[PDB]
Amino acid sequence: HHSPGSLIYTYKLEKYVRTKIFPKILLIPDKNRYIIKGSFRRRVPFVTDIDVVNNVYPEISRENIYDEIIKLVNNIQSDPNIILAYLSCGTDERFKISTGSSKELSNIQSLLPDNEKNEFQLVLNKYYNDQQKKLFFLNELIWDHYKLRWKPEDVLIGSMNLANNVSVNFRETVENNSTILLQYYVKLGSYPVGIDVVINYQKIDLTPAYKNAALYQLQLANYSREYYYMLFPLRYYFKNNQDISQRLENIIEKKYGLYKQLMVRIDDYHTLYKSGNLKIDMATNIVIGILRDIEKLPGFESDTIYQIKKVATNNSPSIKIEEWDILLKVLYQEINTAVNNKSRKYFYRYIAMVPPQDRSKNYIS
Ligand SMILES: Nc1nc2c(ncn2[C@@H]2O[C@H](COP(=O)(O)OP(=O)(O)OP(=O)(O)O)[C@@H](O)[C@H]2O)c(=O)[nH]1
Ligand SMILES: [Mg+2]
Numbered sequence: 001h002h003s004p005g006s007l008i009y010t011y012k013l014e015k016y017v018r019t020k021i022f023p024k025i026l027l028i029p030d031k032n033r034y035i036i037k038g039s040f041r042r043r044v045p046f047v048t049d050i051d052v053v054n055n056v057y058p059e060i061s062r063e064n065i066y067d068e069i070i071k072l073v074n075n076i077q078s079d080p081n082i083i084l085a086y087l088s089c090g091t092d093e094r095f096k097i098s099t100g101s102s103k104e105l106s107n108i109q110s111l112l113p114d115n116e117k118n119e120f121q122l123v124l125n126k127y128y129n130d131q132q133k134k135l136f137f138l139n140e141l142i143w144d145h146y147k148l149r150w151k152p153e154d155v156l157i158g159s160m161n162l163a164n165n166v167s168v169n170f171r172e173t174v175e176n177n178s179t180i181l182l183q184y185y186v187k188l189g190s191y192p193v194g195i196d197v198v199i200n201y202q203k204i205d206l207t208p209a210y211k212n213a214a215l216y217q218l219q220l221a222n223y224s225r226e227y228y229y230m231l232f233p234l235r236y237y238f239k240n241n242q243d244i245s246q247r248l249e250n251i252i253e254k255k256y257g258l259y260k261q262l263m264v265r266i267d268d269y270h271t272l273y274k275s276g277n278l279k280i281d282m283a284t285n286i287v288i289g290i291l292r293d294i295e296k297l298p299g300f301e302s303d304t305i306y307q308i309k310k311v312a313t314n315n316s317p318s319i320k321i322e323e324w325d326i327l328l329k330v331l332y333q334e335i336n337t338a339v340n341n342k343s344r345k346y347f348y349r350y351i352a353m354v355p356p357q358d359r360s361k362n363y364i365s
């Protein structure tokens, strides 16, 4: 005979967010007017974020979306327990890549600051031959220029400045669009957790948006040869096969789930930082939790871990937060590299079970 932590899914957690959090961050909190999507709907053990769609039409439409959003943002800014990092709505069509011709990309590059002009140039050279791969990493670089992203300050003010001294108006933007994305952060457990709320204030079908989001994730993973994330499209393809689905879900969410969570948590650090919602206490707690859970990655070694602990001795809060941010970017790629190496064997195991004619839509050779 013989005898805190990272956020884990419990039904208790879900009941809390639905009854205590959702009534504060949704426009129409009625359970029949919102749908939980993504990994939280699948109740994955290592909670990453929570993705929700609020279908508010017709009670909220283009007629009153502006007033409703202004009211929502004002309520959030008054709540010390809920953070609204960004509000995404609208596009800057000056940064739309349609043809991919040399002058189109030239005109776009001119609008950028010098440091972004260089990075733009590097992508052009590196992928001189692969047109599609060139255009993808170009869109990756000009992403935040093309897709308008608003701080609460920008929303309440009513406008914000874009590149080349062009101003954009918020009311004008939302009244000529159909959806708004709200990126929240809420205390869930021992650190802030992201909640993405999509407001759908037209009666439009979001199906082409989901299909497009799925295709984007496929390209992102494949073009970077991130074999772990390259498993995600396979989860779609085998959703009818019970045995393969269970194994893929286990590999992604259970076997390597903590790798994904740590990557999200590091990203959340960066997002909270650049959005201006990161104080030294919050940043320190996150780094502590990350250092703790890094030790739970079997066989993971990193020189960054020492550098991070070394910085913590400093007294200046701004220096620590900035240095941590730089170091965590490196740690992110180390975690990314580690999980992609471990997952390579599983990707090829299951892509080989895909009929040759269907490999093109699940894999970029
Ligand atoms: N580097 C990298 N990260 C990825 C890729 N695909 C997904 N991720 C990360 O995985 C996270 C999403 O994982 P989950 O939230 O568990 O899955 P999900 O809810 O279906 O995905 P979202 O709709 O993005 O929240 C994102 O926040 C990304 O940080 C990829 O191709 N490359
Ligand atoms: Mg998610």
Ligand SMILES: [Mg+2]
Pocket: 038, 049, 050, 051, 196
């Ligand atoms: Mg999300």
Ligand code: NA
Pocket: 076, 077, 078, 079, 080, 081, 082, 083, 084
């Ligand atoms: Na707030």
